[PDB]
Short mmCIF file of C-alpha atoms in Angstrom, two decimals:
data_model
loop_
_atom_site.label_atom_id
_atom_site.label_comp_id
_atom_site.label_asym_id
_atom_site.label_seq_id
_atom_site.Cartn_x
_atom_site.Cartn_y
_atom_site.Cartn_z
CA UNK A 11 -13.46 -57.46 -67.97
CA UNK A 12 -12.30 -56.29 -64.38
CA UNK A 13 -14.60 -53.66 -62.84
CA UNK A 14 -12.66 -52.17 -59.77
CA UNK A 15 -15.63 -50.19 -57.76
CA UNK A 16 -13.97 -47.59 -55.63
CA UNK A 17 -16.42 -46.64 -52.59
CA UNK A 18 -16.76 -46.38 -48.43
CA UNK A 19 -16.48 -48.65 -46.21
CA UNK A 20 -20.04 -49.45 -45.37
CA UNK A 21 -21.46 -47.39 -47.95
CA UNK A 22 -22.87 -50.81 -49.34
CA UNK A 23 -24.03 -53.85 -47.39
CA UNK A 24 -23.06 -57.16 -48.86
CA UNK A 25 -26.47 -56.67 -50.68
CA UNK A 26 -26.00 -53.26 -51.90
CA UNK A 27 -22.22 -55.35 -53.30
CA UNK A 28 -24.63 -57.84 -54.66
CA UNK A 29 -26.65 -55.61 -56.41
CA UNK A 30 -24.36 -52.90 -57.83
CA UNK A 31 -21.97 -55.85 -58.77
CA UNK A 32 -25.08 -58.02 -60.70
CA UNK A 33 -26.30 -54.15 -62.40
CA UNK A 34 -22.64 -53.98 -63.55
CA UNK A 35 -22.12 -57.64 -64.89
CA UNK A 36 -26.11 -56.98 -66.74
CA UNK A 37 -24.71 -54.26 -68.14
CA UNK A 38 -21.54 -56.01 -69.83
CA UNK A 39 -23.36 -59.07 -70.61
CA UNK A 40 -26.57 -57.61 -72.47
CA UNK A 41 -24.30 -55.12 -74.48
CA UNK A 42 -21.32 -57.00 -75.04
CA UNK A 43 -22.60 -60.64 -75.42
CA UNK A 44 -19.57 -61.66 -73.33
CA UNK A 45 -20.17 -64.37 -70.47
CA UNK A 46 -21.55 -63.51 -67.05
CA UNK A 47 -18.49 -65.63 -65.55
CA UNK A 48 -15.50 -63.60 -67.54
CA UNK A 49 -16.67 -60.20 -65.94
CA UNK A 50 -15.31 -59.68 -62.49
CA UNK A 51 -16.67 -56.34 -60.21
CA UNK A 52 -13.94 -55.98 -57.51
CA UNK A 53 -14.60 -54.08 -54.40
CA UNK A 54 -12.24 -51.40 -52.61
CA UNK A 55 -13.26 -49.93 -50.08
CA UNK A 56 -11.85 -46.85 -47.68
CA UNK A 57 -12.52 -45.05 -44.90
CA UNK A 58 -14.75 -42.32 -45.72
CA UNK A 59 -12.81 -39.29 -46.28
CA UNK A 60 -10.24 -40.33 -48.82
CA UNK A 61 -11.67 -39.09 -51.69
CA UNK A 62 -11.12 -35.54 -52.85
CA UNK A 63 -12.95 -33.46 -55.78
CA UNK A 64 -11.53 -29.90 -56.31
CA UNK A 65 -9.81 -30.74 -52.99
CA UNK A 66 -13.05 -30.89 -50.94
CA UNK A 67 -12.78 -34.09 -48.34
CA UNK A 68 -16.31 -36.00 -50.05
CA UNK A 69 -18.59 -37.99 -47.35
CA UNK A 70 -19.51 -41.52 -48.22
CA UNK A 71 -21.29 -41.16 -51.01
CA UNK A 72 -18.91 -41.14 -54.12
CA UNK A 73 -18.28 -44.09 -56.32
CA UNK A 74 -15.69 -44.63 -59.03
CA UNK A 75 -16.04 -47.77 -61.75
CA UNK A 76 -12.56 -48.33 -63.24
CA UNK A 77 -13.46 -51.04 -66.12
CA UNK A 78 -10.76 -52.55 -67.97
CA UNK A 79 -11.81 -54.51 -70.88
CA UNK A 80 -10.37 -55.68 -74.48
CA UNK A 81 -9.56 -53.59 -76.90
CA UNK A 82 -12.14 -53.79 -80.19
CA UNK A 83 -15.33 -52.52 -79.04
CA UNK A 84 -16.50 -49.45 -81.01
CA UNK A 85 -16.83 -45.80 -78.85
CA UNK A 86 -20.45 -45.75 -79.60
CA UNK A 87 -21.01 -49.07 -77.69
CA UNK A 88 -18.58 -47.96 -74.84
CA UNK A 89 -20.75 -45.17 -74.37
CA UNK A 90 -23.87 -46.89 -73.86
CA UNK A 91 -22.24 -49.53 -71.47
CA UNK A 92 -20.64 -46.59 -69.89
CA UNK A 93 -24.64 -44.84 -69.83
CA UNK A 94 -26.03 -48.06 -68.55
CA UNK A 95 -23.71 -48.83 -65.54
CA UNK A 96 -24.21 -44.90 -64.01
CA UNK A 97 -28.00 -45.46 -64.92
CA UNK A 98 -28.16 -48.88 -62.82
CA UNK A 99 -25.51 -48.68 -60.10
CA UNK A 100 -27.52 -45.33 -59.68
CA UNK A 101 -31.04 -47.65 -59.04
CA UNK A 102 -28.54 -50.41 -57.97
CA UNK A 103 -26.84 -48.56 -54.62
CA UNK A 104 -29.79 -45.80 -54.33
CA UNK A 105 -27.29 -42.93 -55.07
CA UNK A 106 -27.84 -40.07 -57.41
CA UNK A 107 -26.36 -40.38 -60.47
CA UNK A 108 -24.20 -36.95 -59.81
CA UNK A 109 -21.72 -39.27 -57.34
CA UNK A 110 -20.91 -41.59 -60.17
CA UNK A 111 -17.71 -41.38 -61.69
CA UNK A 112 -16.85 -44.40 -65.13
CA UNK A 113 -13.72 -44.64 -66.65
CA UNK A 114 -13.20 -47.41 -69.27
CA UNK A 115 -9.10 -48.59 -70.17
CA UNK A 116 -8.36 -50.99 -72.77
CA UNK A 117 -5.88 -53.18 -73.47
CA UNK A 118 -4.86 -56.01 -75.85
CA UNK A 119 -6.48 -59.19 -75.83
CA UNK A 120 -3.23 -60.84 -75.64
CA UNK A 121 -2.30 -59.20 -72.73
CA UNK A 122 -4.90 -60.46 -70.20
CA UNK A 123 -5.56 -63.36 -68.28
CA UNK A 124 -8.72 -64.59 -66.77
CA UNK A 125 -8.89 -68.18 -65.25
CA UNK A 126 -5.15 -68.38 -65.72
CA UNK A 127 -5.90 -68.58 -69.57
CA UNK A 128 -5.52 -65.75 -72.44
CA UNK A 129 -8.74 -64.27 -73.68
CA UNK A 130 -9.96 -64.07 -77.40
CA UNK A 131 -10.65 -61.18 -79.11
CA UNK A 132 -14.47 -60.17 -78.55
CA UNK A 133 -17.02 -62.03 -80.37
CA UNK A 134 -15.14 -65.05 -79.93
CA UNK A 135 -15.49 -66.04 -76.58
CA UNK A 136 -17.57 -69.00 -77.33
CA UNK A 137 -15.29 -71.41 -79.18
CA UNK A 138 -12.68 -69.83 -77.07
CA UNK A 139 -14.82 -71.60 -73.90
CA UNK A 140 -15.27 -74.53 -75.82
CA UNK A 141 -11.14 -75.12 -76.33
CA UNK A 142 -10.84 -75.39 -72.67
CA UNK A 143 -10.51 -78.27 -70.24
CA UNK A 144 -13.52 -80.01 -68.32
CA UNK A 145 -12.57 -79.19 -65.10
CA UNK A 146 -12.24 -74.78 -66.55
CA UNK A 147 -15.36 -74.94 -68.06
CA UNK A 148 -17.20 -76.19 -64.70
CA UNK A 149 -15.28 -74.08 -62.70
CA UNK A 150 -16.31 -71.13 -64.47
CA UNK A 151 -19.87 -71.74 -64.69
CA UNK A 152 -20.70 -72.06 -61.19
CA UNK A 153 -19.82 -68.40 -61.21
CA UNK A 154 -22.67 -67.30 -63.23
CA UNK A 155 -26.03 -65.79 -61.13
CA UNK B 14 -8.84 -36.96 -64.09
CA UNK B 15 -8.89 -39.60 -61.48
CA UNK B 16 -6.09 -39.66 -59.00
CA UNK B 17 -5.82 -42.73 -57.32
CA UNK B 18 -2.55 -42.13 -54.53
CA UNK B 19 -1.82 -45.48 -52.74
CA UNK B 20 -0.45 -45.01 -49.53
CA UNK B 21 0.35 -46.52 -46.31
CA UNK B 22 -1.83 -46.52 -43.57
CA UNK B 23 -1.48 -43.69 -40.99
CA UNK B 24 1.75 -42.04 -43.26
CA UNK B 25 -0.59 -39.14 -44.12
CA UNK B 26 -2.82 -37.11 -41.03
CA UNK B 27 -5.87 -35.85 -42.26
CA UNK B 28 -4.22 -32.47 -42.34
CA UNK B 29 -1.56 -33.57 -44.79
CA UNK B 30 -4.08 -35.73 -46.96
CA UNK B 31 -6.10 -32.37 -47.55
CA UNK B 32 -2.60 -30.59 -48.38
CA UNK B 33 -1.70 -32.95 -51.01
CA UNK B 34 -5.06 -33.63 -52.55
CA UNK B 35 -4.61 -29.85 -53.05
CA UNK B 36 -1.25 -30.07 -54.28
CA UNK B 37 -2.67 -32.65 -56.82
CA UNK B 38 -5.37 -30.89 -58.02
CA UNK B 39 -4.26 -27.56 -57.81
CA UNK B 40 -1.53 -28.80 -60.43
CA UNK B 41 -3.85 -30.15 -62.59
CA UNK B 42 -5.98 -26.92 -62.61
CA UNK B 43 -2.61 -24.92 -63.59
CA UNK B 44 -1.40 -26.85 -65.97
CA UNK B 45 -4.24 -28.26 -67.97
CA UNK B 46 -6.93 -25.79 -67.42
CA UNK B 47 -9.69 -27.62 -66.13
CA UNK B 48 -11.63 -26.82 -63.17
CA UNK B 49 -10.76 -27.63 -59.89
CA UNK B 50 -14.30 -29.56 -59.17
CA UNK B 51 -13.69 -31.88 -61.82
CA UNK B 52 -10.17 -33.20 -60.49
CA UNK B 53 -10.53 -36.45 -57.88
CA UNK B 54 -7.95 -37.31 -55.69
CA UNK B 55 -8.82 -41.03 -54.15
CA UNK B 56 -6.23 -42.04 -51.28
CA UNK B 57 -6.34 -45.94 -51.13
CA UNK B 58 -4.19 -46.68 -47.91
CA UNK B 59 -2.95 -49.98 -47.11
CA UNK B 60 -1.00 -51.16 -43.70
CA UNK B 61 2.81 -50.57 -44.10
CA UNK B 62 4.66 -53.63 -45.27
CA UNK B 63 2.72 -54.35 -48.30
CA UNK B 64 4.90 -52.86 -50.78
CA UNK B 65 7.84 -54.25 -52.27
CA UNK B 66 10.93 -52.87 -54.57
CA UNK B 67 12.82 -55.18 -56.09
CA UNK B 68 11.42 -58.03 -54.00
CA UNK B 69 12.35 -55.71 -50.38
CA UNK B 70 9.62 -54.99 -48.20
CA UNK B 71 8.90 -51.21 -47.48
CA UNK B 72 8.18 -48.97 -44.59
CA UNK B 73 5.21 -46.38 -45.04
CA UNK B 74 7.17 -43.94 -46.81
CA UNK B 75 6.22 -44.92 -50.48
CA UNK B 76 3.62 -43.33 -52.74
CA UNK B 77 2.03 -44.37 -56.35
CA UNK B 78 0.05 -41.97 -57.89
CA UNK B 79 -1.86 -43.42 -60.19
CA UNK B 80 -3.43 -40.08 -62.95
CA UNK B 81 -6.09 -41.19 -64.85
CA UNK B 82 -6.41 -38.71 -67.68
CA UNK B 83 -8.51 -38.08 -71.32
CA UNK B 84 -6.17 -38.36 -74.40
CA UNK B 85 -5.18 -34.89 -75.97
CA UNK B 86 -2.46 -33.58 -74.32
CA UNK B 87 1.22 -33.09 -75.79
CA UNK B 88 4.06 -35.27 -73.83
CA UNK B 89 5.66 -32.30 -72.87
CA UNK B 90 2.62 -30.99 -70.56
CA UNK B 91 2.36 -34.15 -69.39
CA UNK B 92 6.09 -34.27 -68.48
CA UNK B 93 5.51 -31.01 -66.60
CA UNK B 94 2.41 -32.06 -64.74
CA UNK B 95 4.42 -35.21 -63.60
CA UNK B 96 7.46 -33.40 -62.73
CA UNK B 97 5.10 -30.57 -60.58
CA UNK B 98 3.34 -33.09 -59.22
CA UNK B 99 6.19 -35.49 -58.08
CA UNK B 100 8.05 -31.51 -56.85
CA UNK B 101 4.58 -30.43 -54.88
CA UNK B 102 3.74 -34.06 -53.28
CA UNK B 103 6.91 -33.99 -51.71
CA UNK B 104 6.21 -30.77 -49.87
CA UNK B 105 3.12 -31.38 -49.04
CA UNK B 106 3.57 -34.58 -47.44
CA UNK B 107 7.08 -33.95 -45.81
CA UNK B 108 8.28 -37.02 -47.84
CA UNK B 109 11.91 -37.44 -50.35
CA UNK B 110 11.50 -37.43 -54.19
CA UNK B 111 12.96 -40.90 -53.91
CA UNK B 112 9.86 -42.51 -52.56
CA UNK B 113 7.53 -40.43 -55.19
CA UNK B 114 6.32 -42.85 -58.18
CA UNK B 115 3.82 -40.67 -61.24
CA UNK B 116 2.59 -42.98 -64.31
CA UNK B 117 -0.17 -41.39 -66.96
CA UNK B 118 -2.87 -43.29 -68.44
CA UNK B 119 -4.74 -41.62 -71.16
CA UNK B 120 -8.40 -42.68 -72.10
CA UNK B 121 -11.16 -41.43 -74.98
CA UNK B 122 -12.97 -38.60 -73.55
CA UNK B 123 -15.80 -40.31 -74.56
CA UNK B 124 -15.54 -43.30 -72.42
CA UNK B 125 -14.60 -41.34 -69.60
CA UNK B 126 -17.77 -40.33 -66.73
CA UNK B 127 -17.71 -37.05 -64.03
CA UNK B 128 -20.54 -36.41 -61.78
CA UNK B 129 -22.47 -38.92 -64.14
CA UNK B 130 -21.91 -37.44 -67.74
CA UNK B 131 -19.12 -37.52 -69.87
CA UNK B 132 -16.45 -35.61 -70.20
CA UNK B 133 -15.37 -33.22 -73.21
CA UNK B 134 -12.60 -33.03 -75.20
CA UNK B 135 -9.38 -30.90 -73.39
CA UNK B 136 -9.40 -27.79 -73.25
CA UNK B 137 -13.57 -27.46 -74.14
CA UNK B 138 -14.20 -27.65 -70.95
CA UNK B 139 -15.87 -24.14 -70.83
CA UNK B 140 -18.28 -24.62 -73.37
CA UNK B 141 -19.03 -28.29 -71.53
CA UNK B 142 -19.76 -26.70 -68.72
CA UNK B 143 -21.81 -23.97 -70.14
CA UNK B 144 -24.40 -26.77 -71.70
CA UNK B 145 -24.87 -28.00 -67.98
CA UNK B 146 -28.02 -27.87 -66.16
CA UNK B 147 -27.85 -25.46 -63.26
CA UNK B 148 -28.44 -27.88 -60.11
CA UNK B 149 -25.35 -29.44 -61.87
CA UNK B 150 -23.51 -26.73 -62.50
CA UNK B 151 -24.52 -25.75 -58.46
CA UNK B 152 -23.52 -28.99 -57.32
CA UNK B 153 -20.04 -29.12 -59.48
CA UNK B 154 -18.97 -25.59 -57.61
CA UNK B 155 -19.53 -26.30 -54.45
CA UNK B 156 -16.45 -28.63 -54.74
CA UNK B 157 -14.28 -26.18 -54.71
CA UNK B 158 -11.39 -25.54 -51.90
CA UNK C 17 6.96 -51.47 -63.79
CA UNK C 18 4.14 -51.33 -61.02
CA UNK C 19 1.79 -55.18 -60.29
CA UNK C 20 -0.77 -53.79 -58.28
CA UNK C 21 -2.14 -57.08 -56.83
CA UNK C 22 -5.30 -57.44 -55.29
CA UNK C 23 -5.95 -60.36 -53.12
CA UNK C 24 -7.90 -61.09 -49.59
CA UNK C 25 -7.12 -60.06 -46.80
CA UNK C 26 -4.75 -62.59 -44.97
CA UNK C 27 -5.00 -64.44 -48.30
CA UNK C 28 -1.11 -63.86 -48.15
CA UNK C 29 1.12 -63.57 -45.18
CA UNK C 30 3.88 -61.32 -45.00
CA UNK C 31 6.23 -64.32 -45.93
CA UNK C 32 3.78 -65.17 -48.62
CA UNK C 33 3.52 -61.63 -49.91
CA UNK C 34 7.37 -61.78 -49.96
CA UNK C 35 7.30 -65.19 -52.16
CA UNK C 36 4.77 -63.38 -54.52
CA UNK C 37 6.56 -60.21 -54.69
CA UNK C 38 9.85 -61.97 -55.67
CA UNK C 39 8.20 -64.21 -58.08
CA UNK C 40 6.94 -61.19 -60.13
CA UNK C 41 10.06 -58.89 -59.93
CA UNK C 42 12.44 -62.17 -61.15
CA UNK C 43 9.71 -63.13 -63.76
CA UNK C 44 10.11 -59.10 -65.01
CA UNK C 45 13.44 -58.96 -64.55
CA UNK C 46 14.07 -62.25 -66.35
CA UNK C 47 12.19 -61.26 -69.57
CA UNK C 48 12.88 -57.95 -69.66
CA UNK C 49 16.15 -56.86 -68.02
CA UNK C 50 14.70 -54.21 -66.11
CA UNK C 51 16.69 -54.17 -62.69
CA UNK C 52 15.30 -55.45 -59.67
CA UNK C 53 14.78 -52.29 -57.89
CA UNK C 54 12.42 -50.77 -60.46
CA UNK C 55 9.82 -53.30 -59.88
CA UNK C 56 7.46 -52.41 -57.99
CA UNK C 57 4.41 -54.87 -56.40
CA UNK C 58 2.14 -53.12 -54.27
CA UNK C 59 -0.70 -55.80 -52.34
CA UNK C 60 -4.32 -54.33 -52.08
CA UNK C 61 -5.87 -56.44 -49.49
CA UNK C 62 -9.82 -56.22 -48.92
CA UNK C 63 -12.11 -58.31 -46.89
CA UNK C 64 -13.39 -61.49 -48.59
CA UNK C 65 -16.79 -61.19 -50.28
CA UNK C 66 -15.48 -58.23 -51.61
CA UNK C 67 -14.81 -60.11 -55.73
CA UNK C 68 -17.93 -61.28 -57.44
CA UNK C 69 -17.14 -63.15 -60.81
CA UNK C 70 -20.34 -63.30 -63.07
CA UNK C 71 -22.39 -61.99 -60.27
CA UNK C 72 -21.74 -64.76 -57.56
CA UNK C 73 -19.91 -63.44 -54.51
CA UNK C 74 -16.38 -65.00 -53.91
CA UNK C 75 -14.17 -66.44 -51.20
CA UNK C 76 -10.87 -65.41 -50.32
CA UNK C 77 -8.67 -67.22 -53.49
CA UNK C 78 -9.22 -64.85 -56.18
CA UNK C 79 -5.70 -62.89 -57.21
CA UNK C 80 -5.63 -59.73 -60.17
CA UNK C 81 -2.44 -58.63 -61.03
CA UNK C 82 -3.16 -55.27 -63.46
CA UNK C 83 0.85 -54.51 -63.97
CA UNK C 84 1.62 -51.25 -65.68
CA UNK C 85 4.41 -51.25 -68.25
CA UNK C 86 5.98 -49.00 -70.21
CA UNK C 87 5.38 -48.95 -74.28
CA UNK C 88 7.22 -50.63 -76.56
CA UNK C 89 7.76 -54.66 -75.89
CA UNK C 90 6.18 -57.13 -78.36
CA UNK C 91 3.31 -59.26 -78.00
CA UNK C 92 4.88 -61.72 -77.62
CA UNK C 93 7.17 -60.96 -74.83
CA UNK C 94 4.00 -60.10 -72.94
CA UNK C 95 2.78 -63.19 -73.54
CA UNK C 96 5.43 -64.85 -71.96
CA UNK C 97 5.76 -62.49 -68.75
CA UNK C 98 2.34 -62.68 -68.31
CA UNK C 99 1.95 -66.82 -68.17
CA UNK C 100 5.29 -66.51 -66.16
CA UNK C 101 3.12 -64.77 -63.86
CA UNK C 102 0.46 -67.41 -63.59
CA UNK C 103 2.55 -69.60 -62.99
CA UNK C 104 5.07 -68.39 -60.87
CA UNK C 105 2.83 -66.73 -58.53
CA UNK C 106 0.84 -69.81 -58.72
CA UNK C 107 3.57 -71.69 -56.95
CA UNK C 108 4.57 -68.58 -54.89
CA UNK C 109 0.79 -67.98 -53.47
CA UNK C 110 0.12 -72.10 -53.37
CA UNK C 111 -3.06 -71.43 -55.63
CA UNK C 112 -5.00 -73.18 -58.56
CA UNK C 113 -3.84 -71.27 -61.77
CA UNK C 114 -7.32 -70.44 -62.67
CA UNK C 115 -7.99 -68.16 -59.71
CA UNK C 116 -5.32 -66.14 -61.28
CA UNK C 117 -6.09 -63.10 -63.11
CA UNK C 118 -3.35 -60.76 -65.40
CA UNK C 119 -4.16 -57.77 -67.02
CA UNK C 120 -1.11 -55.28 -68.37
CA UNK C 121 -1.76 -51.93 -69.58
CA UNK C 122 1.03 -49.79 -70.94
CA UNK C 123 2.18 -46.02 -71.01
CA UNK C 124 5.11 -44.44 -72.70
CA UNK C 125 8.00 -44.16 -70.95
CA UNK C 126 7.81 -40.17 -70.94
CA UNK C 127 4.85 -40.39 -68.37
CA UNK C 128 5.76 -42.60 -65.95
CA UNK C 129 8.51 -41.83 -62.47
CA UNK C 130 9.91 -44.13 -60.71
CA UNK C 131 12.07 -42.64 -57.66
CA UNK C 132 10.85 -39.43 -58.68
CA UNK C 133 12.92 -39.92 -61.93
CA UNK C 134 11.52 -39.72 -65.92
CA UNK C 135 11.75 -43.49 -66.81
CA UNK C 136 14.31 -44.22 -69.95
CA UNK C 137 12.86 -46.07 -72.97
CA UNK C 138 12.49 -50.45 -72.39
CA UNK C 139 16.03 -51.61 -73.11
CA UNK C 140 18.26 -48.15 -71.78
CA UNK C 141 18.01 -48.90 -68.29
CA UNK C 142 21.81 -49.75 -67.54
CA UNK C 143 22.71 -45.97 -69.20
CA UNK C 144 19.69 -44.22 -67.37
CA UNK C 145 20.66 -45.87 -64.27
CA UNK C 146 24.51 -44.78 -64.38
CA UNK C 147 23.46 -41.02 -64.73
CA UNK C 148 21.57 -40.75 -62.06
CA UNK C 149 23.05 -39.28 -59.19
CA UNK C 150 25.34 -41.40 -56.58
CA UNK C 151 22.64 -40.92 -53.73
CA UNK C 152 19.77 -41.90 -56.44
CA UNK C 153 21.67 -45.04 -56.89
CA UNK C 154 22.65 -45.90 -53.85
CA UNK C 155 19.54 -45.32 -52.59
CA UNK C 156 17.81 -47.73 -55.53
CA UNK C 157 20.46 -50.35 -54.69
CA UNK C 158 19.30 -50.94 -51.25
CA UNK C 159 16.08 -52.86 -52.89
CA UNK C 160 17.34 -55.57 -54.43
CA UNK C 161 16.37 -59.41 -53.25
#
């Protein structure tokens, strides 16, 4: 998956990134079974002041999680990963669960690209891995925490 | 919905930020129904010169509005809602239809998260918010312009 | 279409940005036909540190391309834009394939504007572009490279 994480600039110190990105990644991993190294949390930050609800200017407190992962996964398991990542980027970034806004978008398998190679459907990630090259697999794992 | 607007740096004052963030969402309201407070707006601003048609770097001048929506809605209020918001951007931000780009994406309501619960189907948005807890409920109004 | 592309900032120069952006809008127009000037790429630049992949913070290398499409191509036309991607902007950005990242998601045509204009359906863009209006073309025209 891609998690883009919409928030302040300097809402989150590169620890607060740390930890809202590793609550995220749990999250997908433990309910999902997919590897810590396919699921990538991607920061954007503003100035505070950019984001609007009912047209009222917010302060710096407002995060929105646009996940885009394969298509396959039933509603009732998006739900709970959904649950799971307002529950722990709430604990994660020490902001009420009231600021946190998750939208999940799907898309075809065949369609996306991670590590410059097509993913599998889901379930199937591990003989997928074990296709690859050498020198992709050991690349990838270094990116696991 | 989510409303992600990409923008150039600087292009939009404060003033005229506020005036189409209310343009947005006071479109949204009118055509769809839902409340105000549950309508985002999220500028993302990036220096002019990093956007390119047909391979042609731009001046500050172009917008993307990205809508992030629930599935439900017929194509023709969608059409509308793109049309009034490509007709009520352009006032509000002093710009030319030409430079004005509106794409749709549609998501399950329920994999889709406000103010840290999910959303209803459209147009149950009443009953929704009438199971709400009051400091919710509280919290929801006052973002309200 | 609109590649939102999300790279470091200074990853890219402008001259760089201009390779990438051209080496996306030829691989679209290539496969698809779609002119030139309704490409759109649009660089989202954050600070490095800002990507984590499987938890582990990241340097400056990573690129995600999430283009938006209209409906109604095959899979396996996809397919080949998308690898045309990888590689192309692998050449254009002088980076390692596998720091390359290439999601599409897709809309119908009825909900997206380009130049404030309905798009056509994939395939009708030659007859949707001659009825627009002289100073619609003309001003479309301008971005071609």
């Amino acid at each position: 998956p891609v998690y883009m994480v919409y928030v302040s600039q300097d809402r989150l110190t590169p620890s607060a990134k740390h930890a809202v990105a590793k609550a995220i990644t749990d999250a997908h991993r433990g309910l999902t079974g997919t590897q810590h190294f396919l699921a990538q949390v991607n920061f954007q930050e503003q100035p505070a002041g950019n984001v609007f609800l009912g047209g009222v200017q917010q302060g710096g407190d407002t995060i929105f999680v646009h996940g885009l992962h394969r298509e396959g996964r039933s509603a009732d398991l998006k739900g709970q990963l959904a649950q799971r990542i307002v529950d722990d980027v709430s604990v994660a970034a020490e902001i009420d669960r009231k600021h946190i806004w998750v939208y999940f978008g799907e898309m075809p398998a065949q369609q996306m690209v991670e590590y410059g190679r097509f993913l599998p459907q889901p379930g199937h990630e591990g003989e997928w891995f074990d296709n690859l090259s050498s020198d992709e697999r050991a690349f990838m794992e270094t990116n696991v925490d």
